[PDB]
Amino acid sequence: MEQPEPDMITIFIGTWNMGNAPPPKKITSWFLSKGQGKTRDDSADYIPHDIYVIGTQEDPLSEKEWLEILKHSLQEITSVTFKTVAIHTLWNIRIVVLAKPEHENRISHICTDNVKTGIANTLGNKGAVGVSFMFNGTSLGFVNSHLTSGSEKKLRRNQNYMNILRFLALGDKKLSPFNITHRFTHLFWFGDLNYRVDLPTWEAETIIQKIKQQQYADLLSHDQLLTERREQKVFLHFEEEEITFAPTYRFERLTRDKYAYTKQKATGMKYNLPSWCDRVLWKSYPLVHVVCQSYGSTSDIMTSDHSPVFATFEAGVTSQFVSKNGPGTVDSQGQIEFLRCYATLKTKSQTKFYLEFHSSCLESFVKSQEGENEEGSEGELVVKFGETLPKLKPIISDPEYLLDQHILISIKSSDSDESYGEGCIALRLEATETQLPIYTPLTHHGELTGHFQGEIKLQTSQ
């Protein structure tokens, strides 16, 4: 007898800047999503999440010490002894992934990496750690970043973000044109992102009184991460749940009754106005199920100048599909065709371009012919592929497999073979054997570089 394979799992994400102090004896409220914000229902307390991903910053513990605390905490809550999937530490920045023991044979292709962000001076305590793995047919990635501190350094934080997403090496290395923002079905990025509430320092007491009233609107309108995202300066194409918990920084230790904001020698004579430093964001491939179930902060863990943050997700997953044909051959009953396709690029360059199509549903990636460059009406380069793109041959034709897949697209220069833009198309279509519009934005280094649009026609065995 075998259990069915899951269609959905739940994932816990935690981020906590520990302020170089040991944790208190009990930290279960964190893993229970209890405290302020969007919290988890009490009736779920004994129900284990499938995967727990724990990001720390300013973590003073050894890996062994922290693992023991984490496993004990989850055992107490759930009566389950979790398996360690991965642990990786850079300086005092750490990521731990734990999973239910039933998932040990569902998890494979485990990767870890780190990125150090500074230059000389600025190099040596900020950066990121990450973990990726496959869960059956679904790729999962997780990034814990500790970005540059200081209210006046939002630009440096955005630069840290770009370095991390360029240089963190996770997932399938065959996806060579793609950075981490395209390599995973579900990507979770969290940490002490260190974006601040940008209000005058003389408004400190006003801010605290707003917090005490649980009136966050006029504060969130000045949150640097929200404003930079709105201006497409950082975290393009990521999501974040609405914030309904108090700022998680900077507290006096051993209570939560007081924000410590005034400039001190220990802060480099900087103010630390109350801010949402500690965040969880995500990006999933188009038309995959992902729902945030909790996003909040604990109220009873007081050893640090930050409060822990939790977020939980229901995430769609797929099985490791086997047919009589693929893997190991094509299924001639399946095809993917593209009509009337063109890329619009922001480049000022005039080279020829071709496409690469990458997907787990193909034996290997497919390179197209060169498109035909035209100039658009408002200055743009338009690369026309017409009806010229190849017919893609998936390994499996069953619609229960193929409609759950995605095609990554890179548009590459013929001259340099470098990608000018990356994007993703879902095969979760409204119809098969029917021409339907497709669209993706194209990015490079996580910044918008163009668009790809056209029509698709998918043939399955039904």
Interior/surface letters 334-351, b for 16+ CB within 10 angstroms, e for the rest: bbbebeebbbbbbbeeee
Residue 112 Cβ vs ligand YBZ, minimum distance, rounded to whole Å: 7
Q: Round to whole Å and give the CA distance between 67 and 336.
A: 46
Q: Under the criterion CB under 6 A, does residue 176 sit at the interface with ligand YBZ?
A: no
Q: Under the criterion CB under 6 A, does residue 171 sit at the interface with ligand YBZ?
A: yes
Q: Which member of 44, 45, 63, 172 binds ligand YBZ (CB under 6 A)?
A: 172
Furthest-apart CA atoms within the chain: distance in Å:
70
168 vs 438 by CB, closer to ligand YBZ: 168
* Site stretch for ligand YBZ (CB under 6 A), options 73-81, 169-177, 204-212, 451-459: 169-177
* Site stretch for ligand YBZ (CB under 6 A), options 27-35, 121-129, 171-179, 426-434: 171-179
- Positive or negative, the CA dihedral 144, 53, 171, 407 is negative
87 vs 341 by CB, closer to ligand YBZ: 87
The contact mask relative to ligand YBZ for 100-119 (x = CB under 6 A, - = no) is ---------x-x--------
111 vs 395 by CB, closer to ligand YBZ: 111
74 vs 85 by CB, closer to ligand YBZ: 85
Q: Under the criterion CB under 6 A, does residue 87 sit at the interface with ligand YBZ?
A: no
Name the closest residue to ligand YBZ (Cβ): 111
Q: Which member of 4, 119, 121, 173 binds ligand YBZ (CB under 6 A)?
A: 173
* Site stretch for ligand YBZ (CB under 6 A), options 170-178, 205-213, 303-311, 325-333: 170-178
Residue 262 Cβ vs ligand YBZ, minimum distance, rounded to whole Å: 45
Residue 181 Cβ vs ligand YBZ, minimum distance, rounded to whole Å: 16
111 vs 317 by CB, closer to ligand YBZ: 111
User: Per CB under 6 A, which of residues 127..146 are in contact with ligand YBZ?
Assistant: 134
Residues making contact with ligand YBZ (CB under 6 A):
109, 111, 134, 170-173
